[PDB]
Amino acid sequence: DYTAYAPLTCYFTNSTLGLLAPPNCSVLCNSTTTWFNETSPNNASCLLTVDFLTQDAILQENQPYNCSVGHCDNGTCAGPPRHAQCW
Amino acid sequence: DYTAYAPLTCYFTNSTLGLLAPPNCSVLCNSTTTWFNETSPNNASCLLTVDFLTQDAILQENQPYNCSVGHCDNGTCAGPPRHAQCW
């Protein structure tokens, strides 16, 4: 395993429009040694809103839900929103 | 662990200028279910060349090495090159 490849694991939301960055276009990542944020690239798909009854998350319900998707614009998620299903 | 975050692990080269995409600006990634390539964003740091005696890699030597770094431009790594150390 000479000069082995460097894995980077980053954490997204699953959706019908693919993996989404958060609304602030900053993704949590982990190298072999560290946890840090990386700014999403401009035009990456990002979560704008999540559209379920707030109490469902308080009850930690493990069910898919309606969400809206935008694109990253200079470190913030921008609309106009598109519909998607998130889980 | 309700609607758990979706991890994506992608594989880079370590360097003194940070994690590098390959010269073709296409990164191997793994979701919880699949292996696939993702195109690097424009202006991501990428490996242009590796500057060691070819036989060293044939001998699978696990040593750091001089490399040159560029930036992704429309799916290919572009110069001008900057020096870095890779491992």
For chain B, the domains span: 9-86
Residue B66 near residue B53, CB atoms below 8 Å: no
For residue A80, whether the previous peptide bond is cis, meaning omega lies within 30 degrees of 0, is yes
What span, in angstroms and rounded, lies between the C-alpha atoms of B77 and B7? 26
**Separation in Å, CA of A80 to nearest CA in chain B:** 22
Instruction: Say whether the peptide bond before residue B80 is cis (omega within 30 degrees of 0).
Output: yes
The conformation of residue B55, written as its DSSP 8-state character, comes to: H
Cβ-based neighbours of B28, under 8 Å, separated by 6 or more:
A5, B10, B11, B35, B36, B37
Chain A contact present for B63, CB below 8 A: yes
First to last CA, chain A: 36
Residue ranges of E strands in chain B? 6-12, 26-30, 35-39, 45-50, 65-73, 76-86
CA dihedral A11, A5, B26, A39 (to 10 degrees): 40
Round to whole Å and give the CA distance between A10 and A18: 14
Fold of A9-86: 2.30.130
B8 contacts A86? CB cut-off 8 A: no
Which two three-digit tokens encode residue A59? 């009850």
CB of A35 less than 8 A from some CB of B = no
- The experimental technique used to determine this model is X-ray
Token output for A75: 């470190």
- The Cα–Cα gap between A55 and A48 comes to 19
